[PDB]
Design a binder for this molecule. Structure first.
Ligand code: ZN
Lengths: 135, 123, 141, 149, 214, 55, 99
RNA sequence: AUGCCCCGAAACCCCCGGGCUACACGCGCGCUACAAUGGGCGGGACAAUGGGACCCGACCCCGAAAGGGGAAGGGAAUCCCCUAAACCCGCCCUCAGUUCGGAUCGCGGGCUGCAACUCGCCCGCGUGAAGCUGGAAUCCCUAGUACCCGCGUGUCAUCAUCGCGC
């Protein structure tokens, strides 16, 4: 059967998604997406499928494995991987244009990463500094 | 005013008791110290105390062992404990059992503050 | 059943609109944990409202408080796990508790220990630093 | 259905309710007077927290098996209020976890793998999966999207 | 507490939070119309990505802007209702999930109380709380002079949203009322032009000061 | 006149159990990889030891 | 089979040794696994610049990087004889294991 | 490292004890809080940087906790520290110096160390002080930055409200 693999990266989270013909079952780390918590993360994961449509959602199966990051970085990585898998599977340039217009980050990764800390209260952050006394 | 008793035992019973039972009766710190054993200086001090109790030692007892734990067999004797400069006399009493010998030889003088100096405040 | 607005258990007036757990905490020497332990030993519901307690339940609480160790409460949950004189495991509440604490402090002062000196002077007793904190008096100079 | 198909908390509470019928699962004699970790401040407010903890430990053994006492302790630990000191993470106690695992083994739900920890027996796997199937069957009406799973 | 069908809500259409649509929401202020984004959006969370670009906030949904404004402490260097609101360890700072839940509950309360679209009520509140004139100092010659100036739509929207958030914080500060209820009450009062609303009171004060200065 | 005195007691721990191999200082000794060097001496011998300043 | 662990300070000497092993295996006629680059070990030490305490605190981050490669070569008389005949430069440490 | 001056049987070397930890007060940097944008209880999730030989120690058993006994593997992409918290769900509390706050004390149990009273750290029970948002004044920050939340390492036999990093 036709099986397509895609990858998504957000912060320190990496998601590998496998897409094949199925009955609309989308699982993240072996768990159904419908019982994903919190609601914000569930919506983040489910947005690309809703954009793609009910028929494409129901006529395909997606399995996503995400490692690293937090509960929001993992959701973003899974969303990007699912979007890329859907575009590659459908081969629909109109769908690709719709995804690009709605949110460019779904198809194009997020380069933003943590800035390394620097002295003068390094544990607080790169730019946070100790309070000045002056007297 | 009542007869002294430590964990339900009198002074005679404490004297007849061995080291292990005394360690059991003592708190955790003293029990651990007794289980680990006495230092050679503490052993020398204990030998001097035993000789004084037997009566073949009449000179005053002085020591630098501020970490020695008071035992019931040391009750009734005056021990001069070093406090940094002098050998402060301490008369051991039954209620003093289980306390460190250095708790009764203060090393710092009481502070009686005087007038603040020129640099004490922002003036 | 009969609901009493104010219930007196061990010389202390317990509230009627509060759960038994926090109601029992009004007695000096009884915290939330010990109150829960006493309720569980007595078989009373910790979450029931105080005031529904009957006389028999009150007496059961009194006898449990009188002898906690003998009633199943562990020996490591009492106020005095090893009494200085008797050597038994005792739990003291209110006047007995203040008397015991005062007696311990007085014994330290009588034997002239360092802790006794610190208690007499009112300065911190557990080896804290007094240069920048523990300032009770007013500004001088 | 499978444990992966249902929310964790609902399955844990249902398994805890079911476990009350097993004679082997019995709270210890010191259960009413203990805390569930040094980082905790007050005693549990359930009066039956032993069954909930046993069910949680059983689900953890099912999922992450083989697992051991120390790993379960660091799972069940948490943040502590240290007064004026900043908050810090601490591990949980070991007696509760050890007693729960021994009781589960006596009931026949888990077994020891030497040098590796404790794994779930087929009986325990079936015990979890039947309850998960019942929970999913109940949830299907409320959430029709779970029917396809 | 919450129903299971609500705890596991599964949307199927592109609409705000999966419950409310902005198709019928109307903005009658020409100044603020181009800067209130009401495009079809399901999740109001762009993870920033708009601070870099100048005038980048014009493409951010109004609900997300409200969530970001709510995600704060309330007061650090200024006083709202005559008090500081310095919440350090118990603030919503950097808690977008909590802000999202608060905003959702406030929208539900607004819908139940009014019977209209909560986004429409929010638009009305913003329109009625956006000031039109301010005062500022201009240095001509060798000294300064206080003169009245107009306010750009960007600053109008920013001030309206900040004032609404501050009023909600003040109403929810150290009272039995919750944050969501306070936000809903503030939005309803601002929409209804009631003077008790902090945003409307601040708008009136600013406009009066500007009129006096001019 | 005894040689038993003027000698240092062995110490398995504490600040006096470690000295810089170049100085003998008892202060900031670096024992990250058995270097046993002062924080001052490391600043001087890092290029010789091969350490560089990539960051 | 034989396992070769080569660790050095400079990637150029590491690559020279690896290329020597690759050429020796190519001429030798054995089945050799490619050079596996293990994660580089970066020893980092942060030290205060000033010898005294006066002035703003400044720090420098000295770093030492150690690169590691792994090679698997099927056992053979002349093969691993020539392998033990490797030049083994000074800055490279080589370990041979038989499994 | 080094010039001059000085001590040179002392200002040089070693050891026991004490002090650097005192305390009417003034000040700088922080931690904890003055609560519902919460406190407690049970349950459900998601990291990274680094370190490990008189060392990290899985796993088993004994304990209510601290902790104690045995012991696999690991000179390390192989084994361990290591199933973080903020976050989510259910219940109690409903604006109160309180189920907020956790200083200050009493009793008891442990760890390290030759030694824990001056002068260490940890746990159980008990008591429960100011504090209900802060004048003049003043500090940091422009994108994964600020805020909030934890973790690793340097010091280390034991001790982190600290520095450097994640
Ligand atoms: Zn040196």
């Amino acid at each position: 059967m036709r099986i397509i693999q895609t990858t998504g990266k957000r912060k320190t989270a990496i998601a590998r998604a496998v897409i094949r013909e199925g009955k609309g079952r989308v699982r993240i780390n072996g768990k159904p997406v419908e019982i994903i918590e919190p609601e914000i993360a569930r919506f983040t994961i489910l947005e690309p499928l809703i954009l793609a449509g009910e028929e494409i959602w129901n006529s395909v199966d997606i399995d996503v494995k995400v490692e690293g990051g937090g509960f929001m970085g993992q959701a973003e990585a899974a969303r990007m991987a699912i979007a890329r898998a859907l575009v590659e599977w459908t081969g629909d340039m109109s769908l690709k244009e719709k995804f690009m217009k709605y949110d460019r980050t779904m198809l194009v990764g997020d380069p933003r990463r943590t800035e390394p800390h620097k002295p003068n209260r390094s544990t607080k952050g790169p730019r946070a500094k100790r309070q000045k006394s002056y007297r | 005013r009542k007869e002294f008793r430590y964990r339900g035992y009198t002074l005679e019973q404490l004297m007849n008791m061995s080291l292990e039972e005394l360690a059991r009766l003592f708190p955790a710190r003293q029990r651990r110290s007794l289980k680990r054993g006495l230092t050679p200086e503490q052993k020398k001090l204990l030998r001097k105390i035993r000789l004084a109790k037997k009566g073949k030692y009449k000179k005053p007892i002085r020591t630098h062992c501020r970490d020695m734990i008071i035992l019931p067999e040391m009750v009734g004797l005056t021990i001069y404990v070093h406090n940094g400069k002098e050998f402060v006399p301490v008369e051991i009493k039954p209620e003093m059992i289980g306390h460190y010998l250095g708790e009764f030889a203060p090393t710092r003088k009481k502070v009686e503050h005087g007038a603040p100096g020129v640099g004490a405040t922002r003036s | 059943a009969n609901f009493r607005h104010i219930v007196r258990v061990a010389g202390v007036d317990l509230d009627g609109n509060k759960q038994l757990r926090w109601a029992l905490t009004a007695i000096k020497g009884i915290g939330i944990n010990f109150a829960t332990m006493v309720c569980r030993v007595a078989g009373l519901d910790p979450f029931m409202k105080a005031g529904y307690l009957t006389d028999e339940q009150v007496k059961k609480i009194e006898e449990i408080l009188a002898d906690p160790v003998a009633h199943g409460i562990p020996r490591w949950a009492v106020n005095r796990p090893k009494d200085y004189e008797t050597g038994r495991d005792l739990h003291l509440i209110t006047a007995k508790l203040d008397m015991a604490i005062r007696e311990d402090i007085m014994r330290l002062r009588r034997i002239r220990a360092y802790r006794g000196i610190r208690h007499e002077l009112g300065l911190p007793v557990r080896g804290q630093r007094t240069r920048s904190n523990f300032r009770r008096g007013q500004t001088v100079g | 259905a499978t444990v992966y198909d249902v929310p964790g908390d609902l399955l844990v509470e249902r398994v805890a309710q079911r476990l009350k019928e097993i004679p082997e699962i019995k709270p210890p004699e010191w259960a009413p007077f203990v805390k569930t970790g040094r980082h905790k401040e007050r005693l549990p407010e359930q009066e039956d927290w032993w069954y909930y903890r046993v069910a949680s430990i059983l689900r953890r053994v099912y999922l992450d098996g083989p697992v051991g006492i120390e790993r379960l302790r660091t799972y069940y630990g948490g943040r502590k209020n240290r007064g004026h000191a900043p908050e810090k993470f601490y591990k949980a106690g070991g007696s509760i976890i050890r007693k729960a695992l021994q009781q589960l083994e006596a009931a026949g739900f888990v077994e020891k793998v030497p040098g590796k920890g404790r794994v779930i027996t087929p009986k325990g796997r079936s015990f979890l999966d039947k309850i998960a199937t019942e929970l999913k069957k109940e949830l299907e009406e409320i959430i029709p999207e779970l029917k396809k799973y | 507490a919450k129903p299971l069908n609500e705890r596991f809500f599964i949307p199927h259409e592109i609409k705000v939070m999966g419950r409310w649509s902005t198709e019928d929401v109307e903005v009658r202020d020409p100044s603020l119309k181009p800067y209130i984004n009401l495009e079809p959006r399901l999740l109001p969370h762009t993870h920033g990505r708009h601070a870099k670009k100048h005038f980048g906030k014009a493409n951010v949904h109004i609900v997300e802007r409200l969530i970001n404004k709510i995600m704060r402490s309330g007061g650090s260097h200024y006083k709202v209702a005559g008090h500081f609101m310095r919440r350090e360890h118990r603030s919503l700072n950097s808690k977008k999930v909590k802000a999202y839940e608060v905003v959702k509950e406030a929208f539900k309360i607004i819908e139940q109380r009014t019977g209209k679209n909560p986004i429409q009520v929010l638009v009305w509140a913003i329109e009625n709380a956006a000031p039109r004139e301010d005062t500022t100092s201009v240095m001509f010659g060798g000294i300064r002079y206080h003169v009245a100036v107009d306010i750009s739509p960007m600053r109008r929207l920013d001030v309206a949203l900040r004032n609404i958030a501050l009023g909600a914080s003040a109403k929810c500060y150290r009272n039995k009322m919750s944050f969501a209820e306070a936000l809903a009450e503030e939005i309803i009062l601002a929409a209804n032009k009631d003077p008790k609303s902090y945003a409307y009171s601040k708008k009136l004060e600013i406009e009066r000061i500007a009129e006096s200065s001019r | 006149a005894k040689a038993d005195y003027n000698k240092r007691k062995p110490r398995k721990f504490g600040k006096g159990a470690r000295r810089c191999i170049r100085c003998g200082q008892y202060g900031p000794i670096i024992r990250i990889q058995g270097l046993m060097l002062c924080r001052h001496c490391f600043r001087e011998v890092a290029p010789k030891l091969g350490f560089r300043k990539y960051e | 089979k034989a396992r070769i662990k080569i660790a050095s300070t400079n990637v150029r000497s590491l690559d020279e040794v690896a290329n020597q092993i690759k050429q020796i295996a190519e001429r030798t006629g054995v089945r050799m696994s490619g050079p596996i680059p293990l994660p580089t070990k970066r020893i980092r030490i942060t030290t205060r610049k000033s010898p005294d305490g006066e002035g703003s605190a400044t720090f420098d981050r000295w770093e030492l990087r150690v690169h590691k490669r792994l090679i698997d070569i099927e056992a053979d008389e002349r093969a691993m004889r020539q392998i033990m005949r490797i030049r083994v430069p000074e800055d490279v440490t080589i370990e041979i294991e038989l499994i």
